[PDB]
From a paper:
In archaea and eukarya, primase is a constitutive heterodimer of a catalytic subunit, [name] or Pri1, and a regulatory subunit, [name] or Pri27. PriX is required for primase activity and the protein is encoded by a gene that is essential for viability. We have shown that PriX has replaced the Fe–S cluster domain of [name] as the primase module responsible for endowing primase with the ability to initiate nucleic acid synthesis.
The [name] structure reveals that the six-helix bundle of globular PriX is docked within the concave arch formed by [name] and [name], and is coplanar with them. [name] was crystallized in the presence of RNA/DNA and the non-hydrolysable nucleotide analog AMPCPP. Although no RNA/DNA was detected in the density map, two AMPCPP molecules were clearly visible. The first AMPCPP was bound in the active site of [name], in what is considered the elongation site of primase12. The 2′-hydroxyl group of the ribose in the bound AMPCPP makes two hydrogen bonds to the main-chain carbonyl and nitrogen moieties of [name] L245 and R247, respectively. Interestingly, the second AMPCPP located in the density map was bound to PriX, at the edge of the PriX-[name] interface. The side chains of the basic 72-RKR-74 motif in PriX contact the triphosphate, with R72 and R74 buttressed by supporting interactions provided by Y103 and D140, respectively.
Numbering used by the authors:
A (entry chain A), B (entry chain D): 11 to 329
C (entry chain F): 57 to 154
D (entry chain C): 48 to 154
E (entry chain E): 3 to 267, 298 to 305
F (entry chain B): 3 to 267, 293 to 306
Write the structure that this text describes.
Amino acid sequence: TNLIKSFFRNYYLNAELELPKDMELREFALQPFGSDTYVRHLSFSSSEELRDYLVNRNLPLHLFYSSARYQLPSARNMEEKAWMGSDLLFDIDADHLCKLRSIRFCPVCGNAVVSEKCERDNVETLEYVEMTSECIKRGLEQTRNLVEILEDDFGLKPKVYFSGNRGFHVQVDCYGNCALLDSDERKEIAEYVMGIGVPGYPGGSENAPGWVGRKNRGINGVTIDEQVTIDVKRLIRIPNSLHGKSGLIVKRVPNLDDFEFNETLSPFTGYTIFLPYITIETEVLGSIIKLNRGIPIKIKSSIGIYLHLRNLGEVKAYV
Amino acid sequence: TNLIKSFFRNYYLNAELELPKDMELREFALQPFGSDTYVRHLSFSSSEELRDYLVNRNLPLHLFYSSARYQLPSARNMEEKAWMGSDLLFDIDADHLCKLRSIRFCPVCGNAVVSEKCERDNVETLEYVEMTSECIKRGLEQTRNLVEILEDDFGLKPKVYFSGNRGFHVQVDCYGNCALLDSDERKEIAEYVMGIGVPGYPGGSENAPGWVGRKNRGINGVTIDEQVTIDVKRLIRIPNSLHGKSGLIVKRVPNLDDFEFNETLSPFTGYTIFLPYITIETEVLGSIIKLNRGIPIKIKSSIGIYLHLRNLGEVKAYV
Amino acid sequence: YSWIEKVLEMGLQDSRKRFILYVASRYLVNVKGVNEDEALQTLKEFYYKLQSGKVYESWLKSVINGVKKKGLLPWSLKRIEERDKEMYNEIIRVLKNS
Amino acid sequence: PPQPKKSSDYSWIEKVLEMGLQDSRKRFILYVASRYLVNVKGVNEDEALQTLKEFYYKLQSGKVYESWLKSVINGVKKKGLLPWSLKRIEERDKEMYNEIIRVLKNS
Amino acid sequence: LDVKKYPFIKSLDDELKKYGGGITLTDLLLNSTTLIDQAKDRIQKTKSGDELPHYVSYNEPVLVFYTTLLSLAILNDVKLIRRYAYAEAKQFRSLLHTENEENLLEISKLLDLKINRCDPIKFYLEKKRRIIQKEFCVHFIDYLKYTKDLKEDWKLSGQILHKGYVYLDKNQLIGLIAESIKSKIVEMIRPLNLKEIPEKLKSLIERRGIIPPCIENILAKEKLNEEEIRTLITFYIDIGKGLSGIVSIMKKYNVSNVEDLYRKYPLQLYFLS
Amino acid sequence: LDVKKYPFIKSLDDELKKYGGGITLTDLLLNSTTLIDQAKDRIQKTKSGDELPHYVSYNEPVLVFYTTLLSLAILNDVKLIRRYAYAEAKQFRSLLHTENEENLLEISKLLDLKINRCDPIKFYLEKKRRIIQKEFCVHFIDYLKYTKDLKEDWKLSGQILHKGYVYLDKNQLIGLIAESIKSKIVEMIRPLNLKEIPEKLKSLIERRGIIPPCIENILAKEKLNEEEIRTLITFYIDIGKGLSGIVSIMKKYNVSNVEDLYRKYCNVKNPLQLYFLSN
Ligand SMILES: Nc1ncnc2c1ncn2[C@@H]1O[C@H](COP(=O)(O)CP(=O)(O)OP(=O)(O)O)[C@@H](O)[C@H]1O
Ligand SMILES: Nc1ncnc2c1ncn2[C@@H]1O[C@H](COP(=O)(O)CP(=O)(O)OP(=O)(O)O)[C@@H](O)[C@H]1O
Ligand SMILES: Nc1ncnc2c1ncn2[C@@H]1O[C@H](COP(=O)(O)CP(=O)(O)OP(=O)(O)O)[C@@H](O)[C@H]1O
Ligand SMILES: Nc1ncnc2c1ncn2[C@@H]1O[C@H](COP(=O)(O)CP(=O)(O)OP(=O)(O)O)[C@@H](O)[C@H]1O
Ligand SMILES: [Mn+2]
Ligand SMILES: [Mn+2]
Ligand SMILES: [Mn+2]
Ligand SMILES: [Mn+2]
Ligand SMILES: [Zn+2]
Ligand SMILES: [Zn+2]
């Protein structure tokens, strides 16, 4: 009996996911627990049909629905699927941005180990990457620029979401001919946002339109993941679903100044007895925390589930 | 699993499913063999049309029709379907009731394994849970009280069915304003049956009406699966269909005292040579059977097909 | 809300249910505030203006109950035009042709 | 040698569009009708949508999305795709072929 | 059953027949000065949380009620309609606690409450210390409807259901009628945003003034100027007029400025204290 | 707006109404001797890379235009059809650089270009040394369409977008019209592989000769011989006839040899001298 599993199953019992109105036209997909391969070609017509599947049939470690709309979302033949438009997506990953503290180690002896196995214990090595709130700050600056471009240059109404782990998703609901844009036409928008072929406007005014004012406000291109925007058939991590690498909620950011990166992003109440793998002092959900190897410690569920899914240790019981 | 198909295909050739009279208003759905995605939005107007589809186009591992009545059962959009009432459903699972014997193991090396995979053979672990007949007995007590509440307090005429695996389904045909009841109004009914907000009537008479007599007859709330009753729309497992986890018949229970949990619930005649995964002694359809790992064994088809779909081994041939 | 009463009084053809679902029912209950049974009989009276076809009373009660419980507001002719152009064009022509 | 031709007779497409079909309405829209209405007859981009929708709803059991038809039209326009030959239809999809031939016999 | 105590029994049309015909309430409301003022009295009493007088303390009881509904409809404040329908139902409660059974069953029959007398039900609790009797029964499908918006005390699991019927005493029959009335009042206000209202009768109920000289300099030239347009609309916003009906009075003009004035979103002769 | 300068405004049917009715272009092309000769002149001028005369240097410009499209359709050479629409748009470019604003916006309205006048946009660059003005705006979705096949000068990241609209000057409005015309011509040639062509009108535009006696020795016996077939077909490949329409000409004969001849792909050389006249 996986204990993280029960947490996830309990959240999905009552959680209300943000689902599109034409729900039956999307392909749903999920990565189950203890299986590295996705289940796809799922289709549901109501949030209740979906909730039954997640809670009784296949509990999701990661949950997605397609940015694209299909006539037959469950068909495996692509021409059967009948692609009929997709939403415009952007994904800002703090990969390129900050480069964080990372530690590879053996979960049995607790030593820093470069290799993929440990010689003594003959166990595979885990890696822990420390997600600081300064990283989320830099990420949050990027999506602020992106919302500026999409609103002022393109006239669109984007929605911002916490990715659940290391950044933000920007999604534009578009229902007209905007949804029918080529993958090629989306690469033109992607390169505009990234400032790839944008000329420097060396001596302009900050109030100039488009990239003229923006370049003279000191702003340059937005570091997005281009392949996310180019793929017409991308999988959107569902808002209010749980990110299987953190246990956090994919949360709408309705005001890009009120966003704080702390435990409130997790929906888990109570406390968990947590068993660390190493003696480490790191920042976890905006709070510096000291863990001691092999020394059980009672912490909140949010912090325990997070540290578990980040390979720092194991949640042993719930109170 | 190629041979299991032939058994099921043979049963559905002659079996007569209990189908509602307004058949053309129901959405039919089924899980085919070897496919994790449901086929749904089917509609049929006669038991013969359904028979052709099941035998020639898509053989069901699980077969359902919707508790809801629709104008367009085959429409994929929910509001296109035009819901015009749905039946009242209850589902009694003997999960919570009995607490059974369970074994997680690797089907290749045959060892007890805590994890979801096995180190040596690189295969995911299967789980076998032993379904005893005392378990079905406890389940039968719950539905007995449930029929009492529905008949004596609500004045309804419920039908009881063996779920085909681990419990019973109770279904009330109602066509007036009972069919149009909210999920909110259905949650009120669900909580009444479960005794959630029912006050203890500490010194009353056993012959008092409603929950006054019932609480003084020693009976408390019924352990149902509330989300099955709360959901306004649900898939009813068709009576006389085969449950793909056991091979048993979804069988009408016309008398709640005469129900015995044994091989008579399965329709499979003959014997099958069965190859167990582990050395185990368990109760199977009320009859204890002893299996030895990797040692083929000649047992009845009913017991073999059952043990197959319960992950204990593989049916290798039919006699 | 003069057009809703005008479309209800004359009738439609193709988008009668999308009009009942998103406009007519929500208007008769959540703006005009008529009796629950008066809206059902009116929506049946409205639907059977083209006279070819059938709609179930159980569905109309279902639509009435759902907009009553959720306080749904009828679609604006602005929303009708952007989102469902087939429905819009049927309404605008019944307004132009009288 | 000189440049060889191909064909020029597309009268049957107009006959199938005018009458209707039954089982293979979408495979006909995707591989024949759309490519013909835009890249052979060269009708308006929006008029083809209005014609293809009118054609599909002859048997009426089923539905086709306006968004899908615009998508198919844009895709055949950008790639200059030409409608399938009655021989190529015959090798690949006999279910569709026999449904078309019956509409051809029925006149 | 006293119409003077329960005005909502008789329809508005059946009351307008005492005064010839064709004369709707909009007409009769201009003659009488006391009616509109009495309706103002109730609204001001619900804003301050005071009891509401029973409608028998009025000379024209039916009319005072509808013009209180019509005043509430014109003010168009939903959060106030809630307080009123609450307070108004609270007032009607007392009148119910003085009524006989046949009258209580008559009111419920007129509110579409399917509540009846039936074979009573007695049972003892705590070894016959407590006794409980119920002589009214409702079908459980109707009962769930009538308790859609009610507290936990009305939850179905706390009731006594037998053979499909929930059993109530008289005090519970009353509590359902009182809630059925709190709903009929909100439902009776919606069909009063129907016809147009003579905008003096409106501004009488609204306690307004007139439109000043500076405004009527504009209703003449039909072309105006530049600052004559930036201010012509910022006035119309302060009355509370909708976005649609503004462009219809000044026809033959620019819609590019209709945008720039929505983005904004003599005055002393209107906001009289 | 001068039809003499821009023939593609009028449809071919709307011009054939000047001549009573029922009379299609096939009729007028046999009466008129000048039309076919003028259409070949343009093609020959684009084959060598020379300028094309404006259609104002023609007495009937509309007819010269379509028969230049119809002639190109008959040759069925896409690599040249591309060259023509290219060259033809260059000719139309210069004419646009002489047209007033009011005319430029009407042509674009007829080419389905959704470009309009808007509130102009001024901004200074390099500390007010450079000035830049733009008074035409197109929605960015349309702009991405209109620049589908265009070079990097039109790439979106090099443009000025505000509230969803790309802002252009007159030279850019013209360059888009010039590209819209390069497309309208290729789109106007496809629906000319539609009708059958009285194969003398076909062979007139092709400038052919006749078919010699040895071939008409065959359209009579309806059974022929053996070597009378190997040469009857190896000739038919040299005309340029398709694989389908050939078996329909000689019916009631063997189709087993139709296969083995696809694999091939008085007078001396009897048919090939009387057909491919160097004229
Ligand atoms: N396995 C997967 N396949 C396809 N798309 C995926 C995906 N996992 C995530 N996506 C989507 O593709 C974009 C980028 O994904 P990733 O950066 O790889 C994971 P994520 O959901 O963004 O969280 P993370 O980046 O904080 O770890 C997002 O819009 C996300 O919704
Ligand atoms: N895969 C599925 N998808 C949707 N509904 C399903 C389903 N399998 C079963 N159901 C329905 O959901 C309700 C409860 O089902 P479950 O408790 O999850 C399994 P079951 O069919 O009742 O058998 P079991 O409980 O004896 O194993 C029933 O109404 C059943 O018909
Ligand atoms: N109840 C409903 N709600 C919303 N859309 C519906 C609907 N029923 C049908 N549609 C829409 O109508 C189309 C197919 O149904 P139709 O045959 O047109 C029913 P309709 O137009 O609503 O009323 P009708 O009975 O007058 O034909 C699709 O575009 C579908 O989306
Ligand atoms: N959009 C599409 N394009 C091409 N083939 C399609 C298709 N949708 C389905 N098919 C193929 O057509 C067969 C039946 O699919 P269907 O769902 O019945 C569409 P159809 O028969 O082409 O049209 P129709 O049912 O709308 O009249 C299958 O072999 C499927 O692979
Ligand atoms: Mn990401
Ligand atoms: Mn069950
Ligand atoms: Mn319709
Ligand atoms: Mn089909
Ligand atoms: Zn180690
Ligand atoms: Zn193993």
